[PDB]
């Protein structure tokens, strides 16, 4: 039942199939406590965000 | 590096919203009006009792990812009935992937937050974050 002709309905912008794909291919760690301060000090502007 | 991206993403996502908090703007504007109501005094007193001993730096991050990924607006009451507790939906969302700090929200979060007041809990958490990182330093 592989190649059945089928049009697709749902528009895959739920961001969650994307997330489950990143946990599948790579071993995603968390952020360091100093890199939080680094990326939050340098992004005080709203346009840069 | 690329093993941080999603967490990096959600951090910056929450960061954008908290910038919306400090410039005094209407900060969601697209989600449904049913969730955008005020807490009563008892719920926000129990919330403050939670937040006095709380890992805010992960709490408001996970809450903001869940709201802007799940509470999208039209057809969002499918699995997210606005009369449940936040503790049950957060632990049910968070046994799939995450291995974080779970006993604090198991033994300390209030049992009767009444879901329809969802984002005002986030507003109180982020303004407590801002009072800590601005009034102190």
Flag if B3 and A26 touch (Cβ within 8 Å).
Answer: yes
**CA dist A41 to A1, B15, B51, B58, B64, Å?**
54, 11, 24, 18, 21
Question: In 3-state terms, chain B is what percent helix, strand and coil (to 5)?
Answer: 55, 0, 40
B23 CA to centre of own chain: 19
Q: What residues of A are in contact with residue B12 (Cβ under 8 Å)?
A: 39, 43, 49
What angle, rounded to 10 degrees, do the helices at B56-70 and B5-22 form?
Answer: 90
Residues 6+ apart with CB under 8 A from B88: none
- What is the number of residues in chain B? 137
Among A18, A28, A32, A47, the strongest candidate for a mutation testing the B interface, having the largest count of B CBs within 10 A, is A28
Q: Counting Cβ atoms within 10 Å, is residue B54 exposed (0-12), middle (13-18) or buried (19+)?
A: buried
What resolution, expressed in A, was reported for this entry?
4.0
Residues 6+ apart with CB under 8 A from B110: B43, B46, B47, B49, B50, B87
Handedness of CA B57, B61, B64, B70 (dihedral sign): negative
What's the DSSP call for residue B52? T
Contact B9, B117 (CB under 8 A): no
Flag if A29 and B5 touch (Cβ within 8 Å).
Answer: no
Say yes or no: A38 contacts chain B, CB-CB below 8 A. Answer: no
Q: What residues of B are in contact with residue A43 (Cβ under 8 Å)?
A: 12, 15
Please report which helix (H) or strand (E) contains residue B8, including its range: helix B5-22
For B5, the token pair is 């991206």
Flag if A30 and B6 touch (Cβ within 8 Å).
Answer: no
Spatial CA neighbour of B122 closest among B12, B21, B10, B25 = B21
Minimal CA separation from B37 to chain A, in Å? 25
């Amino acid at each position: 039942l592989k190649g059945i002709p089928t049009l697709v309905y749902r528009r895959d912008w739920n961001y969650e199939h994307l997330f489950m794909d990143i946990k599948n291919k790579m071993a995603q760690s968390s952020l360091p406590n100093l890199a939080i301060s680094t990326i939050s000090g340098q992004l005080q502007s709203y346009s840069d965000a | 590096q690329l093993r941080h991206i999603i967490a990096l993403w959600q951090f910056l996502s929450a960061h954008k919203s908290e910038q919306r908090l400090r410039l005094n703007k209407e900060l969601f504007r697209e989600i449904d009006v049913q969730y955008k109501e005020e807490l009563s005094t008892q719920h926000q007193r129990l919330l403050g009792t939670f937040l006095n001993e709380a890992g805010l730096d992960a709490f408001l991050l996970e809450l903001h990812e869940m709201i802007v990924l799940k509470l999208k607006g039209p057809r969002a009451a499918n699995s997210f009935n606005p009369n449940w507790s936040l503790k049950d939906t957060l632990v049910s969302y968070m046994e799939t992937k995450d291995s974080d700090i779970l006993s604090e929200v198991e033994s300390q979060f209030p049992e009767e937050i009444l879901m329809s007041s969802c984002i005002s809990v986030w507003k109180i958490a982020a303004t407590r974050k801002w009072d800590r990182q601005s009034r102190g330093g």
